[PDB]
Design a protein around this nucleic acid. Structure first.
Lengths: 328, 121, 40
RNA sequence: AGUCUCCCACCAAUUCGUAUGCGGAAAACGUAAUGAGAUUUAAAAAUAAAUCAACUCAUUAAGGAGGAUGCCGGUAUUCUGCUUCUUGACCUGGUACCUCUAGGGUACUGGUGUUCGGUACUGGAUUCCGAUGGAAUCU
């Protein structure tokens, strides 16, 4: 297991029993908090929102907005085999025992579609044994010998120690203090997220993301819609900006069928594997800029050479700036 | 000398009035919805007065044209949010004073704009 | 401080326009006017 | 219910970079222990002023290790060490340095000599350009 991340000395003293999320100092000013399961999470905002929640996050068609939740409290366990052979086949047994015989099948491994079901606690080590349901689980397979598991905090430890009964054969990283996540709901959700993300190079997985951010009824999309790429520091933009999407307005049901054949497998795997390695995401911080130097960089745009542009977003350097891996 | 030196001694009054009004009532109006434009207006005025603060014209780059988009891109907002304080009805001296100041600033900014045509680039 | 410039500005609008009050989710109340106090 | 406070934009640092008995994002906020005072006072009117309660004020960093008071290796109490770390007052005089344009910025070193900082976004519709970009019009 891992301890609380070091930070400000004053505010790391109060986390002796209940930890903090990255946004706690922001939410605390605008919500009602509680304390459960070792976290200080958020319960509800300070306004009545019974109907607005329904008509912006429900299954209605009157949605003109989105709902974002900071779900960092859900842990993340990155389990992977160490036989050095990509075929694995022993992590398969562990995952098939942990849940019912569901999350190790051709639909979930090869097609790498997300899984949601119920997770048990096997104890078969001496004669009589049984199982007792524990709760929900999110298992995602990668390259047939890497798995990512997302769990509610309450059942985080009980399953974890179970895997520790076979750490002779696997390896586990309690990365719940190193990976964060956000959940988005609503119709105009991807439209808002795509207004604050740009890339470094040209990648097809951003072309698909640009095209599919114009659906407004996400129930039409197929089972699998994974995106994965490398973004730049979002502080460059200084204001959210559309994707110039109004030009193209003839999306039909024939280009959707292309999304099931034109799948960029290698370009997803390469950018994904920069999250299951601590030193890679350590390099991801290689040079994180302070606010003042970004301000000075932006100020240096009032004397540019084109002299007929009047740009606002700062440029991007080829090697002296970090690249943020990102999965959706 | 009339092309310049007759407007600058008017921005020299506008900036002082803005600074006094700023220092006067920061505490009780921090969380309102119009500093997000008021401080922007003050900063844009400051970035203009600082240039040309001497016996000749030390002007290598005439590109403060780029710093004179406070009258095409972000001038409707300041006008359309300084009247909401008038409509809401709890403070009315502030709204009228802000509207007068905005009118003065826009007039002076164009007065500086048209008389210069050295944008031959 | 001359209303002539105000009329010139409103010339980019109608004669006598009417503006709505703020939506109730974008309103704030005035805090105190004196500087903050330190703990003893 | 009110002549009252705080929050509802950000800050690796001209912004309360505030480890301060404990809780708290903060509060003219809550609460624990020891101890002391009321126009003769830190202070109230010319809360209390036999006792207990009430008003106000002063002192007290967390963790962990070692020895002992008491009762069956333990816990409550008591004295002595250790670990926790982002070169941070303001103003100003010197030397060295710099990819900055005779002036600016950075390192080493001397002098007691009540509100002010930077960065940022309007809602909607239509149009134009060999584009994860730029431009114009209306409401």
């Amino acid at each position: 297991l891992a301890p609380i991340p070091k930070g400000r000395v004053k505010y790391t003293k109060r986390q002796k029993h209940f930890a903090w999320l990255p946004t706690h100092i922001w939410n605390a000013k605008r919500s009602h908090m509680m304390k459960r399961w070792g976290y200080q999470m958020v319960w509800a905002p300070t306004q009545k929102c019974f109907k607005l929640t329904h008509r912006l996050g429900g299954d209605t068609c009157s949605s003109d907005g989105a709902l974002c939740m900071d779900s960092s409290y859900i842990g993340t366990i990155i389990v992977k085999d160490k036989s050095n052979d990509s075929e694995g086949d022993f992590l398969k047994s562990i995952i098939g025992k942990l849940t019912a015989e569901r999350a190790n099948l051709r639909k979930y491994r090869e097609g790498q579609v997300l899984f949601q079901g119920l997770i048990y606690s096997f104890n078969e080590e001496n004669g009589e044994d049984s199982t007792k349901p524990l709760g929900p689980c999110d298992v995602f397979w990668v390259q047939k010998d890497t798995a990512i598991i997302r769990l509610h905090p309450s059942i985080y430890t009980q399953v974890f120690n179970i895997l520790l009964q076979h750490k002779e054969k696997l390896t586990v990283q309690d990365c719940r203090y190193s990976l964060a996540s956000v959940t988005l709901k609503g119709a105009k959700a991807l439209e808002s997220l795509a207004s604050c993300l740009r890339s470094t190079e040209y990648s097809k997985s951003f072309e698909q993301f640009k095209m599919v951010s114009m659906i407004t009824d996400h129930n039409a999309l197929p089972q699998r819609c994974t995106f994965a790429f490398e973004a730049i520091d979002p502080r460059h933009l200084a204001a959210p900006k559309k994707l110039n999407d109004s030009q193209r307005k003839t999306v039909n049901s024939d280009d959707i069928l292309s999304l099931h054949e034109n799948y960029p497998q290698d370009e997803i795997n390469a950018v994904f594997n920069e999250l299951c390695d601590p030193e890679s995401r350590t390099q991801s911080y290689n040079n994180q800029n302070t606010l003042k130097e970004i301000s000075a960089r932006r100020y240096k745009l009032l004397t540019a050479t084109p002299n007929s542009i009047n740009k606002t977003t700062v440029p991007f350097k080829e090697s002296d700036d970090p690249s943020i891996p990102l999965v959706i | 000398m009339d092309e310049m030196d007759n407007v600058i001694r008017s921005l020299e009054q506008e900036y002082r009035l803005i600074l006094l009004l700023n220092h006067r009532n920061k505490n009780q109006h921090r969380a309102a919805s119009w500093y997000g434009s008021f401080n922007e207006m003050k900063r844009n005025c400051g970035q203009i007065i600082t240039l040309f603060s001497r016996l000749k014209d030390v002007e290598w780059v005439k590109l403060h044209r780029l710093l004179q988009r406070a009258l095409f891109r972000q001038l409707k907002r300041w006008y359309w949010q300084f009247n909401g304080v008038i409509a809401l009805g709890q403070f009315v001296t502030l709204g009228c004073t802000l509207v007068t100041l905005l009118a003065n600033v826009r007039a002076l900014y164009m007065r500086l704009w048209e008389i210069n045509e050295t944008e031959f680039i | 401080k001359q209303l002539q410039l105000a009329m010139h500005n409103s010339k980019a609008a109608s004669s006598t326009r009417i503006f709505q009050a703020l939506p109730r989710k974008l309103r704030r109340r005035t805090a105190s006017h004196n500087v903050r106090r330190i703990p003893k």
